[PDB]
Coordinates of C-alpha atoms in Angstrom, one line a residue:
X293 CA 94.5 110.8 120.9
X294 CA 95.3 113.6 118.5
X295 CA 95.2 112.3 115.0
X296 CA 95.5 115.7 113.2
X297 CA 98.4 116.6 115.6
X298 CA 99.9 113.0 115.5
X299 CA 100.2 113.2 111.6
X300 CA 101.5 116.8 111.4
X301 CA 104.4 115.7 113.7
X302 CA 104.9 112.6 111.5
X303 CA 104.7 114.5 108.1
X304 CA 105.7 118.2 108.6
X305 CA 103.8 121.4 107.6
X306 CA 105.0 121.4 103.9
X307 CA 103.9 117.7 103.1
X308 CA 100.7 118.4 105.3
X309 CA 99.7 121.5 103.2
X310 CA 100.4 119.5 100.0
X311 CA 98.6 116.3 100.9
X312 CA 95.5 118.4 102.0
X313 CA 95.5 120.3 98.6
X314 CA 95.6 116.9 96.8
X315 CA 92.8 115.7 99.3
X316 CA 90.7 118.8 98.5
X317 CA 91.6 118.9 94.7
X318 CA 90.6 115.2 94.3
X319 CA 87.3 115.5 96.3
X320 CA 86.0 118.9 94.8
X321 CA 87.8 119.2 91.3
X322 CA 85.6 121.9 89.8
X323 CA 86.3 124.3 92.7
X324 CA 88.9 127.0 91.8
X325 CA 92.6 127.2 92.9
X326 CA 92.6 130.1 95.5
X327 CA 89.4 128.7 97.2
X328 CA 91.2 125.4 97.9
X329 CA 94.3 127.2 99.3
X330 CA 92.1 129.2 101.7
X331 CA 90.9 126.0 103.3
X332 CA 94.4 124.3 103.4
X333 CA 96.0 127.1 105.4
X334 CA 92.8 127.3 107.5
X335 CA 93.3 123.6 108.6
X336 CA 97.1 123.8 108.9
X337 CA 96.8 126.7 111.4
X338 CA 94.1 124.8 113.3
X339 CA 96.3 121.7 113.3
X340 CA 99.1 123.7 114.9
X341 CA 96.6 124.9 117.6
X342 CA 96.0 121.1 118.2
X343 CA 99.8 120.6 118.3
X344 CA 99.9 123.5 120.8
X345 CA 97.1 122.0 123.0
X346 CA 95.7 118.4 122.2
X347 CA 92.6 119.2 124.4
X348 CA 91.7 122.5 122.4
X349 CA 88.6 122.9 120.3
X350 CA 87.6 120.2 117.8
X351 CA 91.1 118.5 118.2
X352 CA 89.6 115.1 119.4
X353 CA 87.8 114.7 115.9
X354 CA 89.0 112.1 113.4
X355 CA 90.6 113.2 110.1
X356 CA 87.5 111.9 108.1
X357 CA 85.2 114.0 110.3
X358 CA 87.4 117.2 110.6
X359 CA 88.4 117.2 106.9
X360 CA 84.8 116.1 106.0
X361 CA 83.2 119.1 107.9
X362 CA 85.7 121.4 106.2
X363 CA 84.9 119.8 102.8
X364 CA 81.1 120.6 103.5
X365 CA 81.8 124.4 102.7
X366 CA 77.0 115.7 98.7
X367 CA 77.4 116.0 102.6
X368 CA 74.0 115.9 104.3
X369 CA 75.2 112.6 106.0
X370 CA 77.6 111.3 108.7
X371 CA 81.2 110.1 108.4
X372 CA 80.3 106.4 107.6
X373 CA 78.3 107.7 104.6
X374 CA 79.5 111.3 103.9
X375 CA 82.9 110.1 102.7
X376 CA 81.6 107.4 100.4
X377 CA 79.1 109.8 98.7
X378 CA 82.2 112.0 98.0
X379 CA 84.3 109.0 96.9
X380 CA 81.5 108.1 94.3
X381 CA 81.4 111.8 93.3
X382 CA 85.0 111.6 91.8
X383 CA 85.0 112.4 88.0
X384 CA 87.4 110.1 86.1
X385 CA 87.1 112.5 83.0
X386 CA 85.8 115.9 84.1
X387 CA 85.1 118.6 81.5
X388 CA 88.3 120.6 82.3
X389 CA 90.2 122.3 79.5
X390 CA 93.3 120.2 78.8
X391 CA 96.0 122.3 80.3
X392 CA 98.1 124.1 77.6
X393 CA 101.9 124.5 78.3
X394 CA 102.7 128.2 77.7
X395 CA 106.2 129.5 76.7
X396 CA 109.3 128.4 78.6
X397 CA 110.4 132.0 79.3
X398 CA 106.8 132.6 80.5
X399 CA 106.8 129.5 82.8
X400 CA 110.3 130.3 84.2
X401 CA 109.1 133.9 85.0
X402 CA 106.1 132.7 87.1
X403 CA 108.3 130.0 88.8
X404 CA 110.6 132.9 90.0
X405 CA 107.7 135.3 90.7
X406 CA 106.3 132.8 93.3
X407 CA 107.9 129.3 93.7
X408 CA 105.2 128.2 96.2
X409 CA 102.2 129.4 94.1
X410 CA 103.7 127.8 91.0
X411 CA 104.3 124.3 92.6
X412 CA 100.9 124.4 94.4
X413 CA 98.9 125.2 91.2
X414 CA 100.8 122.2 89.6
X415 CA 99.6 119.9 92.4
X416 CA 96.1 121.4 92.1
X417 CA 95.7 121.2 88.2
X418 CA 97.1 117.6 88.2
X419 CA 95.2 116.1 91.3
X420 CA 91.9 117.6 90.2
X421 CA 92.3 115.9 86.7
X422 CA 93.5 112.6 88.4
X423 CA 91.2 112.2 91.5
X424 CA 92.7 108.7 92.4
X425 CA 96.4 109.7 92.1
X426 CA 98.7 108.0 94.8
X427 CA 99.2 111.0 97.1
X428 CA 102.7 110.1 98.6
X429 CA 103.8 109.5 94.9
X430 CA 102.3 112.9 93.6
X431 CA 104.5 114.6 96.2
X432 CA 107.6 112.9 94.6
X433 CA 106.3 114.2 91.2
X434 CA 106.1 117.7 92.7
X435 CA 109.7 117.6 94.1
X436 CA 110.9 116.5 90.6
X437 CA 108.9 119.3 88.9
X438 CA 110.5 121.8 91.2
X439 CA 113.9 120.4 90.5
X440 CA 113.3 120.7 86.7
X441 CA 112.4 124.4 87.1
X442 CA 115.2 125.2 89.6
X443 CA 117.8 123.7 87.3
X444 CA 116.7 124.4 83.6
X445 CA 115.7 128.1 84.3
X446 CA 119.3 128.8 85.3
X447 CA 120.5 127.1 82.1
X448 CA 121.5 128.9 78.9
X449 CA 119.1 126.9 76.6
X450 CA 116.1 126.6 79.1
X451 CA 113.6 124.8 76.7
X452 CA 116.3 122.2 75.7
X453 CA 116.6 121.3 79.4
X454 CA 113.0 121.8 80.7
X455 CA 110.8 120.4 77.9
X456 CA 112.2 116.8 77.9
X457 CA 112.2 116.7 81.8
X458 CA 108.5 117.7 81.8
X459 CA 107.4 115.3 79.0
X460 CA 109.1 112.5 80.9
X461 CA 107.1 113.3 84.1
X462 CA 103.8 113.8 82.2
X463 CA 104.2 110.4 80.7
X464 CA 105.3 108.8 84.0
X465 CA 102.3 110.6 85.7
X466 CA 99.7 109.2 83.3
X467 CA 101.1 105.7 83.9
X468 CA 101.2 106.3 87.7
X469 CA 97.6 107.5 87.8
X470 CA 96.2 104.6 85.6
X471 CA 98.3 102.0 87.5
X472 CA 96.8 103.1 90.9
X473 CA 93.2 103.6 89.5
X474 CA 93.2 99.7 89.1
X475 CA 94.4 99.4 92.8
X476 CA 91.4 101.5 93.9
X477 CA 88.9 99.6 91.7
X478 CA 90.2 96.3 93.2
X479 CA 89.5 97.6 96.8
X480 CA 86.3 99.6 96.1
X481 CA 84.5 97.0 94.0
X482 CA 86.0 93.5 94.7
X483 CA 87.2 94.0 98.3
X484 CA 90.4 93.8 100.3
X485 CA 90.7 90.0 100.1
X486 CA 91.1 90.4 96.3
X487 CA 93.7 93.1 96.7
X488 CA 95.5 91.0 99.4
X489 CA 95.8 88.0 97.0
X490 CA 97.0 90.4 94.2
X491 CA 99.5 91.9 96.7
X492 CA 100.6 88.4 97.8
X493 CA 101.5 87.3 94.2
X494 CA 103.2 90.6 93.4
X495 CA 105.4 90.9 96.6
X496 CA 106.3 87.1 96.4
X497 CA 107.6 87.7 92.9
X498 CA 109.5 90.8 94.1
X499 CA 110.9 89.0 97.2
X500 CA 111.0 85.2 96.5
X501 CA 113.7 84.7 99.2
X502 CA 111.4 86.2 101.9
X503 CA 109.3 83.6 103.9
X504 CA 105.4 83.6 103.8
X505 CA 104.9 85.2 107.3
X506 CA 107.3 88.1 106.3
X507 CA 105.4 88.7 103.0
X508 CA 102.0 88.4 104.9
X509 CA 103.2 91.2 107.2
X510 CA 104.2 93.4 104.2
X511 CA 100.9 92.5 102.4
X512 CA 99.0 93.6 105.6
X513 CA 100.8 96.9 105.8
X514 CA 100.7 97.7 102.0
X515 CA 96.9 96.9 101.9
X516 CA 96.5 99.4 104.8
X517 CA 98.4 102.1 102.8
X518 CA 96.5 101.7 99.5
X519 CA 93.1 101.2 101.3
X520 CA 93.5 104.6 103.2
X521 CA 94.7 106.4 100.0
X522 CA 91.8 105.0 97.9
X523 CA 89.4 105.8 100.8
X524 CA 90.6 109.5 100.9
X525 CA 92.6 109.2 104.2
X526 CA 95.6 110.8 102.3
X527 CA 97.4 111.9 105.6
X528 CA 97.2 108.3 107.1
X529 CA 98.3 106.9 103.6
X530 CA 101.5 109.1 103.6
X531 CA 102.5 108.0 107.2
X532 CA 102.1 104.2 106.8
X533 CA 103.9 104.2 103.3
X534 CA 106.8 106.0 105.0
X535 CA 106.5 103.6 108.0
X536 CA 106.5 100.6 105.6
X537 CA 109.6 101.8 103.7
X538 CA 111.4 102.1 107.1
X539 CA 110.6 98.5 108.2
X540 CA 111.7 97.1 104.8
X541 CA 115.1 99.0 105.0
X542 CA 115.7 97.7 108.6
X543 CA 114.8 94.1 107.6
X544 CA 116.3 93.9 104.1
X545 CA 118.2 90.7 104.9
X546 CA 114.9 88.9 105.5
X547 CA 113.3 90.6 102.4
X548 CA 115.7 91.2 99.3
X549 CA 119.4 91.8 98.4
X550 CA 118.2 94.4 95.8
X551 CA 117.4 97.0 98.5
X552 CA 120.9 98.5 99.2
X553 CA 120.4 101.4 96.6
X554 CA 116.8 102.2 97.5
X555 CA 117.6 102.3 101.3
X556 CA 120.3 105.0 100.7
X557 CA 117.8 107.4 99.0
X558 CA 115.7 110.0 101.0
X559 CA 112.0 109.7 102.1
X560 CA 110.0 110.5 98.8
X561 CA 112.8 108.9 96.7
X562 CA 112.8 105.8 98.9
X563 CA 109.1 104.9 98.9
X564 CA 109.0 105.3 95.0
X565 CA 112.3 103.2 94.6
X566 CA 110.9 100.1 96.6
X567 CA 107.5 100.3 94.8
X568 CA 109.4 99.8 91.5
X569 CA 112.3 97.5 92.3
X570 CA 113.7 94.6 90.1
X571 CA 112.8 91.1 91.3
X572 CA 115.2 89.3 93.6
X573 CA 116.9 86.0 92.5
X574 CA 114.6 82.9 92.8
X575 CA 116.0 80.6 95.6
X576 CA 117.9 77.3 94.9
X577 CA 116.0 75.1 97.4
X578 CA 112.3 74.7 96.4
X579 CA 109.9 71.7 96.6
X580 CA 108.0 69.8 93.8
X581 CA 105.0 72.1 94.6
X582 CA 102.5 69.3 93.7
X583 CA 104.1 67.1 96.4
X584 CA 102.6 69.4 99.2
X585 CA 99.5 70.9 97.5
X586 CA 98.0 67.7 96.0
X587 CA 100.3 64.6 96.8
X588 CA 99.6 65.2 100.5
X589 CA 96.6 63.6 102.3
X590 CA 95.7 66.4 104.8
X591 CA 95.3 69.2 102.2
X592 CA 91.5 69.4 102.8
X593 CA 92.1 69.4 106.6
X594 CA 94.4 72.5 106.3
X595 CA 92.1 74.3 103.8
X596 CA 89.1 73.7 106.2
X597 CA 91.0 75.2 109.3
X598 CA 91.5 78.5 107.4
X599 CA 90.9 79.0 103.6
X600 CA 92.6 82.4 103.0
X601 CA 96.0 81.4 104.5
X602 CA 96.5 78.0 102.7
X603 CA 95.5 79.8 99.5
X604 CA 98.1 82.5 100.5
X605 CA 100.9 79.9 101.0
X606 CA 99.9 78.4 97.5
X607 CA 99.9 81.8 95.8
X608 CA 103.2 82.9 97.4
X609 CA 105.0 79.6 96.4
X610 CA 103.5 79.5 93.0
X611 CA 104.4 83.2 92.3
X612 CA 108.0 83.0 93.8
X613 CA 108.9 80.2 91.3
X614 CA 107.3 82.2 88.4
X615 CA 108.3 85.9 87.9
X616 CA 107.7 85.1 84.2
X617 CA 104.0 84.5 85.0
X618 CA 101.8 87.6 85.0
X619 CA 100.2 88.4 88.4
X620 CA 96.7 88.2 86.8
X621 CA 97.5 84.6 85.4
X622 CA 98.9 83.6 88.9
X623 CA 95.6 84.8 90.5
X624 CA 93.6 82.7 87.9
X625 CA 95.5 79.5 88.8
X626 CA 94.8 80.4 92.4
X627 CA 91.0 81.0 91.7
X628 CA 91.0 77.6 89.8
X629 CA 92.8 75.8 92.7
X630 CA 90.2 77.4 95.1
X631 CA 87.0 76.4 93.2
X632 CA 88.6 72.8 92.7
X633 CA 89.2 72.3 96.5
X634 CA 85.6 73.5 97.5
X635 CA 84.2 70.7 95.2
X636 CA 86.8 67.8 95.8
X637 CA 87.3 68.4 99.6
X638 CA 84.0 66.8 100.8
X639 CA 83.4 64.8 97.6
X640 CA 84.1 61.1 98.5
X641 CA 87.9 60.4 98.4
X642 CA 89.2 64.0 98.0
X643 CA 92.8 62.9 97.0
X644 CA 91.5 60.9 94.0
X645 CA 89.5 64.1 92.9
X646 CA 92.1 66.9 93.3
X647 CA 94.9 65.1 91.4
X648 CA 93.9 66.6 87.9
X649 CA 94.3 70.1 89.3
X650 CA 97.7 70.8 87.6
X651 CA 96.2 69.7 84.3
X652 CA 93.7 72.7 84.5
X653 CA 96.6 75.2 84.8
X654 CA 97.9 74.2 81.3
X655 CA 95.3 76.0 79.1
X656 CA 95.3 79.1 81.3
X657 CA 99.1 79.7 80.8
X658 CA 98.8 79.2 77.0
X659 CA 95.9 81.8 76.5
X660 CA 97.9 85.0 77.2
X661 CA 101.2 83.7 75.6
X662 CA 99.3 83.1 72.3
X663 CA 97.6 86.6 72.1
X664 CA 100.9 88.3 73.2
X665 CA 102.8 86.4 70.4
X666 CA 100.0 87.2 67.9
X667 CA 99.9 91.0 68.7
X668 CA 103.7 91.5 69.1
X669 CA 104.1 90.0 65.6
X670 CA 101.4 92.4 64.3
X671 CA 103.3 95.3 66.0
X672 CA 106.5 94.2 64.1
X673 CA 104.5 94.4 60.8
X674 CA 102.8 97.7 61.6
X675 CA 104.6 99.8 64.3
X676 CA 103.1 101.9 67.1
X677 CA 100.7 104.2 65.2
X678 CA 99.6 101.6 62.6
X679 CA 99.3 98.9 65.4
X680 CA 97.1 101.3 67.4
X681 CA 94.8 101.7 64.3
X682 CA 94.4 97.9 64.1
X683 CA 93.2 97.9 67.8
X684 CA 91.1 101.0 67.1
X685 CA 89.2 99.2 64.4
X686 CA 89.0 96.0 66.4
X687 CA 87.5 97.5 69.6
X688 CA 85.1 99.9 67.8
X689 CA 83.7 96.7 66.1
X690 CA 83.7 94.8 69.4
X691 CA 82.0 97.6 71.4
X692 CA 80.7 100.4 69.1
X693 CA 78.3 102.1 71.7
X694 CA 81.4 103.3 73.7
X695 CA 82.1 107.1 73.2
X696 CA 84.6 108.0 70.4
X697 CA 87.1 109.8 72.7
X698 CA 87.3 106.8 75.0
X699 CA 87.8 104.4 72.1
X700 CA 90.7 106.5 70.7
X701 CA 92.7 106.9 73.9
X702 CA 92.1 103.4 75.3
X703 CA 93.2 101.8 72.0
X704 CA 96.1 104.3 71.9
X705 CA 97.4 103.0 75.3
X706 CA 96.4 99.4 74.2
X707 CA 98.8 99.8 71.3
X708 CA 101.5 101.3 73.6
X709 CA 101.9 97.7 75.0
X710 CA 103.9 97.0 71.8
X711 CA 106.8 99.3 72.5
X712 CA 106.7 98.5 76.3
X713 CA 106.6 94.7 76.2
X714 CA 107.5 93.3 72.7
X715 CA 111.2 94.7 72.9
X716 CA 111.4 92.8 76.3
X717 CA 112.7 89.2 76.2
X718 CA 110.1 86.4 75.4
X719 CA 110.1 85.6 79.2
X720 CA 109.4 89.2 80.5
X721 CA 106.8 89.8 77.8
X722 CA 103.9 88.0 79.7
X723 CA 104.0 89.9 83.1
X724 CA 104.7 93.1 81.2
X725 CA 101.8 92.9 78.7
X726 CA 99.0 91.1 80.6
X727 CA 99.4 93.3 83.8
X728 CA 99.6 96.5 81.6
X729 CA 96.4 95.4 79.7
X730 CA 94.8 95.0 83.1
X731 CA 95.6 98.8 83.7
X732 CA 94.4 99.9 80.2
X733 CA 91.2 97.8 80.2
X734 CA 90.4 99.1 83.8
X735 CA 90.5 102.6 82.1
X736 CA 87.9 101.5 79.6
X737 CA 86.0 100.2 82.6
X738 CA 86.1 103.4 84.8
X739 CA 85.6 105.8 81.8
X740 CA 82.5 103.7 80.6
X741 CA 80.9 103.6 84.1
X742 CA 80.1 107.4 83.8
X743 CA 77.4 107.1 81.2
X744 CA 76.9 103.4 80.4
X745 CA 75.9 102.6 76.7
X746 CA 77.6 99.2 75.8
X747 CA 76.3 96.5 78.2
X748 CA 79.1 94.2 76.8
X749 CA 81.7 96.5 78.4
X750 CA 79.4 96.7 81.5
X751 CA 79.4 92.8 81.5
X752 CA 83.2 92.2 81.1
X753 CA 84.1 94.9 83.7
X754 CA 81.7 93.7 86.5
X755 CA 82.4 89.9 86.2
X756 CA 86.0 89.7 87.4
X757 CA 89.2 91.7 87.5
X758 CA 91.3 88.8 86.5
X759 CA 89.3 87.6 83.5
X760 CA 88.7 91.1 81.8
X761 CA 91.6 90.7 79.2
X762 CA 90.2 87.3 78.0
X763 CA 86.6 88.7 78.2
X764 CA 87.4 91.5 75.8
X765 CA 89.6 89.1 73.7
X766 CA 86.5 86.8 73.5
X767 CA 84.1 89.6 72.2
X768 CA 83.4 89.2 68.5
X769 CA 82.2 92.0 66.1
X770 CA 78.8 93.3 67.3
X771 CA 76.4 92.6 64.3
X772 CA 73.4 93.5 66.6
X773 CA 74.7 97.1 66.5
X774 CA 72.7 99.6 64.4
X775 CA 75.2 101.5 62.1
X776 CA 75.7 105.3 62.6
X777 CA 74.3 107.8 60.1
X778 CA 76.9 109.7 57.9
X779 CA 77.8 113.1 59.4
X780 CA 79.7 115.5 57.1
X781 CA 80.7 117.8 60.1
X782 CA 82.8 115.1 61.9
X783 CA 84.7 113.9 58.7
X784 CA 85.7 117.5 57.7
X785 CA 88.7 119.0 59.7
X786 CA 89.4 122.7 60.2
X787 CA 92.6 124.8 59.6
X788 CA 93.4 124.4 63.3
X789 CA 94.9 120.9 62.5
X790 CA 98.0 122.5 60.9
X791 CA 98.8 124.4 64.2
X792 CA 98.7 121.1 66.2
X793 CA 101.6 118.5 66.8
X794 CA 102.2 115.2 65.0
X795 CA 100.6 113.3 67.9
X796 CA 97.6 115.6 68.2
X797 CA 96.9 115.2 64.4
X798 CA 97.2 111.4 64.8
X799 CA 94.6 111.5 67.6
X800 CA 92.3 113.6 65.4
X801 CA 92.9 111.1 62.4
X802 CA 92.3 108.1 64.7
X803 CA 89.1 109.9 66.0
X804 CA 87.8 109.9 62.4
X805 CA 88.8 106.2 61.9
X806 CA 86.5 105.3 64.8
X807 CA 83.5 107.3 63.3
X808 CA 84.3 105.6 59.9
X809 CA 83.9 102.1 61.5
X810 CA 80.7 103.4 63.4
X811 CA 79.0 104.4 60.0
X812 CA 79.9 101.0 58.3
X813 CA 81.2 98.3 60.6
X814 CA 81.0 95.8 57.7
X815 CA 84.0 97.6 56.0
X816 CA 87.2 95.3 55.8
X817 CA 90.9 96.3 56.5
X818 CA 91.3 96.7 52.7
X819 CA 88.4 99.3 52.5
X820 CA 89.5 101.3 55.6
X821 CA 93.2 101.4 54.4
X822 CA 92.0 103.2 51.1
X823 CA 90.1 105.8 53.2
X824 CA 93.1 106.0 55.7
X825 CA 95.4 106.7 52.7
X826 CA 92.8 109.3 51.5
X827 CA 92.6 111.2 54.9
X828 CA 96.4 111.1 55.6
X829 CA 97.3 112.5 52.0
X830 CA 94.7 115.4 51.9
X831 CA 95.8 116.9 55.3
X832 CA 99.5 117.0 54.0
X833 CA 98.0 118.4 50.7
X834 CA 96.2 121.3 52.5
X835 CA 98.5 122.0 55.6
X836 CA 101.8 121.9 53.6
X837 CA 100.3 124.2 50.9
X838 CA 98.7 126.8 53.3
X839 CA 97.5 128.7 50.1
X840 CA 93.7 128.3 50.2
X841 CA 93.0 127.4 53.9
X842 CA 89.6 126.5 52.3
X843 CA 91.5 123.4 51.0
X844 CA 89.9 121.4 53.8
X845 CA 86.4 122.9 53.0
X846 CA 86.7 121.6 49.3
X847 CA 86.2 118.0 50.8
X848 CA 82.5 116.9 50.9
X849 CA 81.5 113.2 50.4
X850 CA 83.7 110.4 49.1
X851 CA 82.4 106.8 49.8

């Protein structure tokens, strides 16, 4: 009967003060650093007064209420509502200056000058920019960031040690945020049942030797964890993730053989290790599948008694045999099998109706395998940057109304699928690619939601989680779109481009390629290549020869 006390005891002052800064940083975002800290110590000192006396002032309150009231300095509502208004307040792309990394001697100075203030401002500036970041995982990022600054500042060549370690984390963190933004969308827009099915098919692939009732218990506990994190109960998220990692390590025998390494590591390292663990060996003894889920007579009787748990047993069995199948594809086969039983179960002789069910699976498996083969071959012919430019032109044509910054980054990460999944074996390609495209297309979804402009994106995002990749892969070139007017200001770069990195220049060039398609969408790959060769050469012509910084200015209108 002391939630704030119960958690402090389960989590410790340091993890408490951190989770609360992520909880505050994610819910307010525009509020400054020091202001957030004020409120964090204010709660942590009050939490200790509730640890000292569980019947002291305001110690009977719930975390939502207590943290909600402290957030109120939206609001104007009660807990059932107040939190949701705040959850819908979260900016997926706030106007915050992209944080500039200062010098390595500068950063190592400040780290020494105040370790706590350095690592807290890291948690703040990240969590404000990623308001749906998995909180127990951002703490693991913070421990590793500390470890990079504690090691590499004592090193002779500090920047040779520090800069790689940081870039690794930044890349891992972008991937961790995006991955879990999809987890939140699934819960907040399509419900827990959807998440549960997703979680059944993922964990069954991860632990094929585990029996259905064991997986079901993990799926229940993992849904609890991710629900709470996505709903802003960060403290309760942290406890149950830790609680889940313990149960798995105590019952590995009944779960996976691949847990021996992860169960040696400590608390933050352990949770992160299991979340990302290689799939266990598929068992030797497995049925015909069809023999029990169509060739039986009492399949409608079982489905009628409870729908969600027969569908669970199907998904678990289907998934455990197919780790080479993407989780999204496995969910589609499960949706198909669900819509087919609703119709055939009452219809005359059900058995004679549901026999063609395995025939409906065949096209659904082919669809992703064809696009993945097609686009991995394109990536061999082009390479990351050029392959990105192919997808940049493609999606600007498909949905031109979308903002130019969104089009660039989304198609950048869409192209990143090439490096990540095409070098993989032809078997691992499908789960790698499809499930990654789920993540990158969900970014287009959550970024577009802010100021809607292309109703085609609106349409594909709202219809279904599972059929978003094929929905966007179905969209043809929008010929209804009214072409953009030529703007000389956008197609003329400044001298600032020479002081920026290779990647930053690529983004800027790729930004111009989106505008170039928006002015004339009828332009072919041949036409756009001639203007791409034109823009790439003139920047190397001006930047390399810094004589006449007005070199860029000499460029007016070529069409």
